[PDB]
Write an enzyme that holds these catalytic residues in place. Structure first.
Site, short mmCIF file in Angstrom:
data_model
loop_
_atom_site.label_atom_id
_atom_site.label_comp_id
_atom_site.label_asym_id
_atom_site.label_seq_id
_atom_site.Cartn_x
_atom_site.Cartn_y
_atom_site.Cartn_z
N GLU C 105 1.24 -1.30 0.31
CA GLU C 105 -0.05 -0.28 0.39
C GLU C 105 0.53 1.18 0.03
O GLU C 105 0.33 2.43 -0.84
CB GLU C 105 -1.17 0.10 0.71
CG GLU C 105 -1.55 -1.10 1.02
CD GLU C 105 -3.12 -1.66 2.30
OE1 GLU C 105 -2.71 -1.26 3.31
OE2 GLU C 105 -4.28 -1.40 1.51
N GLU C 125 -3.95 -10.23 3.93
CA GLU C 125 -4.58 -9.83 5.30
C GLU C 125 -5.42 -10.85 5.40
O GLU C 125 -5.67 -11.08 6.29
CB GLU C 125 -5.16 -8.45 5.06
CG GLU C 125 -4.67 -6.96 4.80
CD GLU C 125 -3.51 -6.77 4.06
OE1 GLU C 125 -3.47 -7.22 2.97
OE2 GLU C 125 -2.68 -5.17 4.28
#
Lengths: 251, 251, 251
Positions: C105, C125
């Site tokens: 990210e 995740e």
């Protein structure tokens, strides 16, 4: 004439005829392109156009000499020829040599790009302390991966046609010198299909980018209904049933 | 039965069982697909579905014979099975042979595509004087480079699976005849992850396309909060700490 | 210091200095990154920044130990360092080893990515029953083909740098250990161009994603006018005419 126009069957061939200036866009060329698109869209005898540059080079961008003396190269409501108002019928760009700055922006305003294996694209405006304002910054990130578009915009580097084909910018890689014939073959496939369905298919794809998933099918349905009730739709079904070529009327 | 449904662990296998008609979608198949998605989303014992066509062909599109006699193949609120209402849980399409017209539109309405090396996609509607209205014109330009989507739409040409893999349309290239097993392996990786986190991840990606950068993090946060307070989130942390497999409950 | 900052000509080199923790982001690193971007954007002596991780690894994501004890890693209005507020000047990420979860990210919030041939990205995740909330689900589908972004999000699988280069996520593939030098070469090309035109080009590309085709040229024109009336624009033209390097002032 700085723009040459030739009718071949249902295909309009538009050639920028300024090769000693690397086919850069002056006021003359910009008006010629706009007229050529008005001819394409306005003539019921035409289905597809091809844009190319003569002499082995597509387009070096806006003519710097003409920009210097203050010519009106940008025509209000059309931009650089048609960058701010692309035609409604399909437009194919056939690219030899360099298509840089405004030249890459002409190619981006087309629907499809045929490029010789040895051709190159690029937007080097920042190298002069300028910005590409002919739509390159608004279309390139929607045509190739965002980071690559960003890189070319920030560096001004050339994008060689082989890489542009890998990135999805170029539809057909042609042998050097043969881009125009490859574009004609692609244009001939498009002209063989239903004229109304072809114009409606492009209209749905282009106008859907400014639509919302909320209302996308509703908007699309309004374009679909005239094509599905068209005479050509019935002719399409009969011709496929009889295993023969359909004879389109555009109604 | 024109649609076969099989439960294998947490995976729902949906097979179009119309191979003599090349698995074309009639009213029967369209209703079967919608029911199958209602089963997937409604059964807490299921995580992922796979859609495939039996006999070596994915789906030739809407059944022309059924379109001719006026069957209601399109069910209001779902489209061609689910083209206008994709499921909330993940859907994988496993493609052998041809997936054309409505068939490519079924694959586009899935989340992931597994395709045999010898399979092909395409939207040849314009060749009949028609337009692809099952979402192909709205999703293909968001799945592969815009110019390529435009080319396939205007020509009706086939997109071979190897090229579709290069363009990012196909996730996994499978050996011919083995697409279904490759899709199962992909589905089994998805089912091993947190059910709530998987369903929330897809929901954020799909619903973010209709969001605005202004409000994208705010909208995403509302979906994030229930997953982060979930029992599964605590189980995920404990299981990773103890270097063992987590036992999801979906709460 | 958990974040190292070095000025080299007009280039700011930002190094996450937490290698024994695989450069995971704690509160310290998050504040360091935000400060580094404020330095980049606020110093008129700087054009471009590079973000990298020391010791052969880019960033393992948010520090799990720091998340456990409740540190404020996310700073309101900036996110993970700058995920929710990227800088206005160009940012290049140079990636060795792993860039996972929050690490991917960080790379997505940059403009350009340079990655070693043996590096990997990913958002795992869901494997822990969590969701990637640092912008990965909002940017990856706009950076690589939608289906591939969806696959990585649903499986948590690694995306090896060679594939990420093929998909358009990675701008430059570097030899292992040399990513930082490749990023410097890319940064040096950007710093050689007109500072105002570079900052305006990125601003048009980033802000055009939240614009509408209706108003895209109008919005772009407001950004174009100050660059075209700038002192640098005149210097760019003079220097190209005299076949010499332009001396930018940023005015």
């Amino acid at each position: 004439p700085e723009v040459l126009v030739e009718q071949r069957d249902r295909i309009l061939i538009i050639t920028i005829n300024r090769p000693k200036a690397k086919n850069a866009v002056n006021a003359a060329v910009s008006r010629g392109l706009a007229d050529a698109m008005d001819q394409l869209d306005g003539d019921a005898g035409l289905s597809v156009a091809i844009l190319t540059g003569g002499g082995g080079s597509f387009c070096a961008g806006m003519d710097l000499k003409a920009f210097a003396r203050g010519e009106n190269v940008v025509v209000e409501g059309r931009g650089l020829g048609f960058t701010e108002r692309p035609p409604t019928k399909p437009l194919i760009a056939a690219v030899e040599g360099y298509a840089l700055a405004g030249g890459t922006e002409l190619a981006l305003a087309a629907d499809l790009i045929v490029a010789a294996r040895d051709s190159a694209f690029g937007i080097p405006e920042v190298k002069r302390g300028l910005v590409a304002g002919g739509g390159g910054l608004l279309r390139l990130p929607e045509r190739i991966p965002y980071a690559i578009a960003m890189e070319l915009a920030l560096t001004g580097d050339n994008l060689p046609a082989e890489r542009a084909h890998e990135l999805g910018l170029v539809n057909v890689l042609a042998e050097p010198g043969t881009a125009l014939d490859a574009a004609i073959a692609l244009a001939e496939k498009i002209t063989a299909n239903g004229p109304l369905a072809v114009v409606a298919t492009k209209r749905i794809i282009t106008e859907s980018r400014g639509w919302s998933p909320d209302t996308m099918f509703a908007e699309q349905m309004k374009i679909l209904v005239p094509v599905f009730t068209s005479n050509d739709a019935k002719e399409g079904a009969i011709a496929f049933a009889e295993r023969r070529r359909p004879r389109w009327t555009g109604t």
